[PDB]
Design a protein around this motif. Structure first.
Motif, short mmCIF file in Angstrom:
data_model
loop_
_atom_site.label_atom_id
_atom_site.label_comp_id
_atom_site.label_asym_id
_atom_site.label_seq_id
_atom_site.Cartn_x
_atom_site.Cartn_y
_atom_site.Cartn_z
N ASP A 168 0.90 -1.28 -0.10
CA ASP A 168 -0.02 0.00 -0.08
C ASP A 168 0.80 1.11 0.26
OD1 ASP A 168 -2.14 -1.78 0.21
OD2 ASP A 168 -3.04 -1.01 1.93
N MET A 169 2.11 1.13 0.58
CA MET A 169 2.92 2.39 0.69
C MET A 169 3.76 2.53 -0.42
SD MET A 169 3.91 2.16 4.70
CE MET A 169 3.07 3.26 5.95
N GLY A 170 3.76 1.36 -1.40
CA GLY A 170 4.03 1.63 -2.82
C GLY A 170 5.43 0.55 -2.83
N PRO B 204 11.03 -3.07 3.08
CA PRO B 204 10.85 -1.75 2.84
C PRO B 204 9.92 -1.05 3.74
CG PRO B 204 10.14 -3.04 0.97
CD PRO B 204 10.65 -4.03 2.18
N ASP B 205 8.99 -1.80 4.02
CA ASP B 205 7.77 -1.54 5.06
C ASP B 205 7.37 -2.81 5.89
OD1 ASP B 205 5.87 -2.54 3.29
OD2 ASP B 205 5.36 -0.66 2.13
N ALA B 206 6.55 -2.32 6.68
CA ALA B 206 5.67 -3.31 7.64
C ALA B 206 4.90 -4.54 6.90
CB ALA B 206 4.91 -2.73 8.71
N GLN B 207 4.04 -3.97 5.84
CA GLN B 207 3.16 -4.89 4.78
C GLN B 207 4.06 -5.93 4.26
OE1 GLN B 207 0.71 -2.72 2.51
NE2 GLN B 207 -0.42 -4.36 1.78
N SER B 208 5.28 -5.34 3.77
CA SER B 208 6.03 -6.21 3.00
C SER B 208 6.51 -7.70 3.59
CB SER B 208 7.55 -5.55 2.84
OG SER B 208 7.35 -4.31 1.89
N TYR B 209 6.33 -7.85 4.72
CA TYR B 209 6.54 -9.05 5.27
C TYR B 209 5.37 -10.13 4.87
CZ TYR B 209 10.69 -8.07 7.80
OH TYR B 209 12.09 -7.91 8.32
N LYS B 210 4.09 -9.48 4.56
CA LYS B 210 2.97 -10.18 4.23
C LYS B 210 3.18 -10.16 2.60
CE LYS B 210 1.98 -10.93 8.39
NZ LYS B 210 0.79 -10.22 9.08
N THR B 211 3.15 -9.13 2.29
CA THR B 211 2.78 -8.93 0.57
C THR B 211 3.94 -9.76 0.01
OG1 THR B 211 2.23 -6.60 0.75
CG2 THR B 211 2.90 -7.14 -1.43
N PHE B 212 5.08 -10.19 0.35
CA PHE B 212 6.07 -10.88 -0.23
C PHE B 212 6.50 -11.91 0.76
CE2 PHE B 212 6.75 -6.46 -1.62
CZ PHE B 212 6.49 -6.84 -2.87
N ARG C 169 20.24 -4.78 24.20
CA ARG C 169 19.70 -3.93 22.97
C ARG C 169 18.56 -4.50 22.35
NH1 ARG C 169 23.11 -5.35 18.35
NH2 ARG C 169 21.43 -6.88 17.69
N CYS C 170 17.42 -3.63 21.94
CA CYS C 170 16.36 -4.07 21.23
C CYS C 170 16.08 -2.73 20.10
CB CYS C 170 15.12 -4.24 21.85
SG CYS C 170 14.36 -2.72 22.71
N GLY C 171 15.39 -3.14 18.94
CA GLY C 171 15.02 -2.45 17.71
C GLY C 171 13.59 -2.35 17.90
N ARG C 172 13.09 -1.13 17.36
CA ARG C 172 11.76 -0.63 17.05
C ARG C 172 11.56 -0.01 15.91
NH1 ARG C 172 11.30 -4.29 20.79
NH2 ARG C 172 10.15 -4.09 22.79
N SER C 173 10.48 -0.37 14.94
CA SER C 173 9.92 0.64 14.09
C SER C 173 8.64 1.14 14.84
CB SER C 173 9.79 -0.30 12.90
OG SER C 173 10.56 -1.11 12.27
N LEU C 174 8.25 2.38 14.33
CA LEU C 174 7.07 3.17 14.83
C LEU C 174 6.02 2.89 13.84
CD1 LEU C 174 8.67 6.57 15.80
CD2 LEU C 174 8.95 4.43 16.80
N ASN C 175 4.78 2.53 14.40
CA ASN C 175 3.77 2.30 13.66
C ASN C 175 3.13 3.17 12.97
OD1 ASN C 175 1.67 -0.18 13.51
ND2 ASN C 175 0.16 1.53 14.15
N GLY C 176 2.98 2.84 11.48
CA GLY C 176 2.40 3.82 10.57
C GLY C 176 3.61 4.37 9.48
N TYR C 177 4.93 4.05 9.63
CA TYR C 177 5.85 4.62 8.96
C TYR C 177 6.49 3.28 8.28
CZ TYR C 177 5.62 8.87 11.57
OH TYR C 177 5.24 9.97 12.22
N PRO C 178 6.90 3.60 6.97
CA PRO C 178 7.79 2.97 6.17
C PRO C 178 9.23 2.76 6.68
CG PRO C 178 7.41 4.74 4.84
CD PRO C 178 6.52 4.93 6.01
N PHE C 179 9.92 1.54 6.33
CA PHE C 179 11.26 1.46 6.76
C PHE C 179 12.08 2.04 5.77
CE2 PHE C 179 9.59 -2.72 8.65
CZ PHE C 179 8.76 -2.19 9.30
N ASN C 180 13.48 2.21 6.17
CA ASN C 180 14.51 3.07 5.33
C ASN C 180 14.29 3.06 4.06
OD1 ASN C 180 16.10 4.33 7.45
ND2 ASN C 180 16.89 2.43 8.02
N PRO C 181 14.28 1.63 3.28
CA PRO C 181 14.36 1.93 1.79
C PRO C 181 13.42 2.77 1.07
CG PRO C 181 14.44 -0.33 2.70
CD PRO C 181 13.90 0.45 3.91
N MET C 182 12.24 3.23 1.95
CA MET C 182 10.98 3.82 1.24
C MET C 182 10.96 5.18 1.97
SD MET C 182 9.53 2.12 -1.18
CE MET C 182 7.96 2.81 -1.02
#
Length: 348
Positions: free
Chosen positions: A45-47, A70-78, A126-139
């Protein structure tokens, strides 16, 4: 959905992979004709497209993994590519398997693993977090980078007590502040060629920055490889204090900033090697007697699912497992394995 020039580059990428005889990447292994043909026409959806997943592995044939989200949805889409690679890397996490719900667990069950300071030089979780609603670095766009950093700074500014500290934006950082963060070992720069080829360092350094608390026992990187990288560390073996500090900080951030979390995969990040808990708990330890028989040291560490890597007999020992166990389980087995390594040392 996908434009013909992307499709053609994707096909040229596939062919390169197939013709690279000395390519050992998971990308090459699991991107079959069938998986490729299944995915190439898909877009989030984020392209994001399959190219946004694959590009770094095409460019960098020597990649271990070779793909990024590239985004959260990418795990599912691909999923048809992510699933087999996640399964391979995380050593048996199947398409049908599910990561547990978040559980930091009972802090009172953590201790100082070396109260006399005989073995453990330093402890770090150490941990990592993405913020909800935002694409990841590639996008991510420049405006997104900036606006996200704004939100993050909001929460950094409201840390209390032990967590209060300073935020240093990379944008407009002076060379004296830089030198201090280098001396501290707290600075990050633009990424290597694996990150560049993944488009994971665009619009640099907008939205990038560093936060540490006053005592320099807590560190955050904003918009390096992930939206947030969150690190608690100190001299000695007080894992209780270190872990407890990390958890307090994550929950403070989360007060007003929801994280990207999947039911199947747990906390979602830009790199698939870093899903689930996203936790790396580690110590630096000096084990004089075990250091002399590394075979025995690896074996014992192995019983608790711990990895051993060197640097005078010093080793960094950490949990290898991120997925399929809770935050509590991951750090508790680290604790148990270090206790046992200490008991082994003392006894020998």
């Amino acid at each position: 959905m996908v434009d013909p020039a992307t499709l053609s580059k994707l096909e040229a990428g596939f062919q390169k992979l197939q013709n690279a005889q000395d390519c050992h990447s998971l990308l090459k292994k699991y991107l079959t004709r069938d998986v490729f043909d299944q995915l190439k026409n898909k877009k989030t959806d984020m392209g994001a497209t399959l190219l946004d997943v694959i590009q770094s592995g095409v460019e960098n044939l020597d990649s271990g993994v070779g793909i990024y989200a590239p985004d959260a949805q990418s795990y599912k889409t691909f999923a048809a590519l992510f699933d087999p690679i996640i399964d391979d890397y995380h050593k048996g996490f199947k398409p049908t398997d599910k990561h547990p719900k978040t559980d930091f667990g009972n802090i009172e069950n953590f201790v100082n693993v070396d109260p006399k300071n005989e073995y453990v030089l330093s402890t770090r979780v150490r941990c990592g977090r993405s913020l909800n609603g935002y694409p990841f670095n590639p996008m991510l766009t420049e405006a997104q980078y900036k606006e996200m950093e704004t939100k993050v700074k909001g929460q950094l500014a409201t840390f209390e007590g032990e967590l209060k500290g300073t935020y240093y934006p990379l944008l407009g950082m002076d060379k004296a502040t830089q030198q201090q963060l280098i001396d501290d070992h707290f600075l990050f720069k633009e990424g290597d060629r694996f990150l560049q080829a993944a488009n994971a360092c665009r619009y640099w350094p907008v939205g990038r920055g560093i936060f540490h608390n006053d005592k320099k026992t807590f560190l955050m990187w904003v918009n390096e490889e992930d939206h947030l990288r969150i690190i608690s560390m100190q001299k000695g073996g007080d894992l209780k204090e270190v872990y407890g500090r990390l958890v307090k900080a994550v929950k403070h951030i989360e007060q007003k900033i929801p994280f990207s979390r999947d039911d199947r995969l747990g906390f979602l990040t830009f790199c698939p090697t870093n899903l689930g808990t996203t936790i790396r708990a580690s110590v630096h330890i000096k084990l004089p007697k075990l250091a002399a028989d590394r075979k025995k040291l690896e074996e014992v560490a192995g019983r608790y699912n711990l990895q051993v890597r060197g640097t005078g007999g010093i080793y960094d020992i950490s949990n290898k497992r991120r997925m399929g166990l809770t935050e509590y389980q991951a750090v508790k087995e680290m604790q148990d394995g270090i206790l046992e390594l200490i008991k082994m040392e003392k006894s020998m």
